[PDB]
Amino acid sequence: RPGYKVTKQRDSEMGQQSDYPEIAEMPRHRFMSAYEQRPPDRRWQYLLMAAEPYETIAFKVPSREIDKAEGKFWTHWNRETKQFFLQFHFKMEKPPAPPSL
């Protein structure tokens, strides 16, 4: 089928130079319904992506379902945050590039 892939880039050691192992060890994604907003129009989902310092980011998903796979890996249980994050995210921490698909 068809799936979406996002490539989010982060700072180049510009401001992160000022490192006390406070959750410094990855970005997190969640699917949010527009039913709740700071409340005019709504009816679609957003693939929100968040990192401590930087500001949140959203991507509208009109299609009811895309790339929603079926047992991709062989059922290994490190929930991390949720099935979504472990299932389909990569965090190039050395280069600071977060891929999501």
Give the residues lining the site for another protein (CB under 8 A): 4, 23, 25-26, 28, 30, 32, 36-38, 46, 48, 50, 52, 55-63, 65-66, 68-72, 75, 77-82
**Residue with smaller CB distance to another protein, 50 or 92:** 50
Residue 46: both structure tokens together? 């957003």
**If you search the block for the tokens 């991507």, which residue do you land on?**
59
Give the distance, in angstroms, between the CA of residue 18 and the centroid of all CA atoms in the same chain. Answer: 25
Query: Minimum CB separation from another protein for residue 48, in Å?
Result: 6
Q: Which of 26, 13, 30, 24 is nearest to 90 (CA)?
A: 26
Smallest separation (angstroms) from another protein to the CB of 9: 13
